[PDB]
Each structure stands twice: as structure tokens, then as C-alpha cells.
Design a protein around this ligand. Structure first.
Ligand SMILES: CC(=O)Nc1ccc(-c2ccnc(Nc3ccc(N4CCOCC4)cc3)n2)cc1
Length: 288
């Protein structure tokens, strides 16, 4: 199957809701009775013209991706008399890695964190070969199939690199996850493979903090900057902080070797940052 029908595909559960739209658990039942495959359906809320243009680009990006650590594309569903667009993805039962690590839990140590770390790296290597820049790497955007496998999701902010340059300038945003952003992504709005490496360093940081309330990237940066400051002054302070080796501290219980990987990812020099292939091999060699 590649095209999913509106008359079938029955609602089961609401998975996620935000300003972008809503992702919902559904069962595609063509026969149908009750025996059918469970799939995740993504739609839009507060929809305009530009959001459909970006959503259609998001579908095409996800369609071109076929990897064990990337959320699988199933198809598309045209609803409301073929006047609305919906993305069909596979369903992963254990939700986001952010919720999975906070609640499943005192069962994950460094070597299991590195297993998830390695899988994120391998998925990012696949995205590099297709010249895609994720731009939104976070533990909340990584989905969990089972205790042994995690998959990269949320490709809404993913941009395709031009044939001319190795970077992509994005001016549109307005609201952006600035605490995962690279210095050049903040100052010059430049996004590349190396900016994803920077963001991955923050993802690796999130994992070894076990997402404890006070140890989160936004909470730690605002502690160094001053949690009393609001609007742009946060960004001005963050830029000056990152320019002069201001970094997220080593998590409680995190080995020195792992924090070295974080700091290497957090390099102000763009070209000095390690590739995702270098990271995946280093992480796997530490595992055994
Ligand atoms: C912005 C965006 O792209 N969001 C998003 C959210 C999701 C998924 C997705 C894809 C495949 N499977 C799942 N499964 C899943 C199952 C349970 C939860 N939760 C468990 C209960 O608590 C709420 C979340 C979340 C996701 N989600 C894809 C794109």
C-alpha cells in the first residue's frame, strides 16, 4: 500500500499536539472488521498556504529516506473530499526518547545511552548522503520502537542543501530552539552538517543528564545567563557566552571521555567538528 483512503483509517488515540498540527494513532482497516495495521497520521492546525508547502516538502523528504534509524514512510491520505493533506507513518509504541528516558529510566546506563547515541549518528549519516539538514535534533524528536532501537523523527524543519554550497541560510523562523543551535546558526543563520553535529552534542548531553528537570539545556543556559532576563537579551547573552567557551556542564555521573565528545561537537570552528561517521565509530568502539 502507498495511498491510504479517507473512508477507512479509523482514529485510535491522540499522540501529539502543538502549533504545527496534530499527530494521531490510527488503524488502517480496508477489509476491514478489526484486523489492520497500526499507523501514525500527521495533520495541520491553524493551517495557511505556506504550511502546506512545507508539509509537502516534509513528505517528500521522508519518502526518500529508508533507514533503520529513521521513522518509516507509509504513504499519504487525502481527506475532506481530497481537499486536505495527511502524512502516514509507522507507529512506534514507546513514544519520544525524552519521555522514555525520564520514565524508563533507572534501567539505562552509559552503554545503553551509547546504543541510542550510535543509532542517532547512523541515521544522521544517512541524511548527510542525501544532503539533508535536520535543523531540529532533540530527544523529544527521537522516537522509540523498542528498548533496543530508536528512530529520528520530526522532519518539518529539514532543509535540502543546494548544489552550490555546503550551508543553508534560514531566515524564516522567528521562534527557534536557540539552546540547541550552533553559534553560526544564531549569528549568521547558517545551517549545515556541522550545525547538526553541534545539535547532536546537545542531544548527547540530554541523554547523560537523563532529562532531569534542572539539568535541561534551556534551564542550564538560563542559569549561566540569568533566568531573570527576557527577549533578545537572552540571545545576545547566549552568543557572547558560546563565543568564549561557555558550555553546558558535565552531567552528574557522566564519564570524561563522553563529555570530550560533547565538547568536540561544541567547537566554534565549523570545520574542526567531527563527522557523524567519526562519532558513530568512536561511540561503538567505547561500547565494547
Ligand atoms: C512534530 C512531529 O513531527 N511530531 C511527531 C510526533 C510523533 C511521531 C510519531 C511517529 C511514529 N510513531 C509515533 N508514536 C508515538 C507513540 C506514542 C507517543 N506518546 C506516548 C504517550 O504520550 C504522548 C506521546 C508518541 C509517539 N510517533 C511523529 C511526528
Amino acid at each position: 500500500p502507498t495511498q491510504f483512503e479517507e473512508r477507512h483509517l479509523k482514529f485510535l488515540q491522540q499522540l501529539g499536539k502543538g502549533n504545527f498540527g496534530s499527530v494521531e494513532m490510527c488503524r488502517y482497516d480496508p477489509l476491514q472488521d478489526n484486523t489492520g495495521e497500526v499507523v501514525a497520521v500527521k495533520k495541520l492546525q491553524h493551517s495557511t498556504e505556506e504550511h502546506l508547502r512545507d508539509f509537502e516538502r516534509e513528505i517528500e523528504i521522508l519518502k526518500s529516506l529508508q533507514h533503520d534509524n529513521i521513522v518509516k514512510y507509509k504513504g499519504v491520505c487525502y481527506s475532506a473530499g481530497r481537499r486536505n493533506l495527511k502524512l502516514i507513518m509507522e507507529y512506534l509504541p514507546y513514544g519520544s526518547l525524552r519521555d522514555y528516558l525520564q520514565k524508563h529510566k533507572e534501567r539505562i546506563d552509559h552503554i545503553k545511552l551509547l546504543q541510542y547515541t550510535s543509532q542517532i549518528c547512523k541515521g544522521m549519516e544517512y541524511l548527510g548522503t542525501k544532503r539533508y539538514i535536520h535543523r531540529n535534533l532533540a530527544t523529544r524528536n527521537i522516537l522509540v520502537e523498542n528498548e533496543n532501537r530508536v528512530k529520528i523523527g520530526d522532519f518539518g524543519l529539514t532543509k535540502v542543501l543546494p548544489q552550490d554550497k555546503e550551508y543553508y541560510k534560514v531566515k524564516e523562523p522567528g521562534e527557534s530552539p536557540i539552546f540547541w543551535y550552533a553559534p553560526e546558526s544564531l549569528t549568521e543563520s547558517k545551517f549545515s552538517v556541522a550545525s547538526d553535529v553541534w545539535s547532536f552534542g546537545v542531544v548527547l548531553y540530554e541523554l547523560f543528564t537523563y532529562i532531569e528537570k534542572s539539568k535541561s539545556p534551556p534551564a542550564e543556559f538560563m542559569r549561566m545567563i540569568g533566568n531573570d532576563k527576557q527577549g533578545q537579551m537572552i540571545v545576545f547573552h547566549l552568543i557572547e557566552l558560546l563565543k568564549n567557551n561557555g558550555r553546558l556542564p558535565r552531567p552528574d555521573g557522566c564519564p570524561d571521555e563522553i563529555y570530550m565528545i560533547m565538547t568536540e561537537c561544541w567547537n566554534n570552528n565549523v570545520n574542526q567538528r567531527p563527522s557523524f561517521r567519526d562519532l558513530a565509530l568512536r561511540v561503538d568502539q567505547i561500547r565494547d
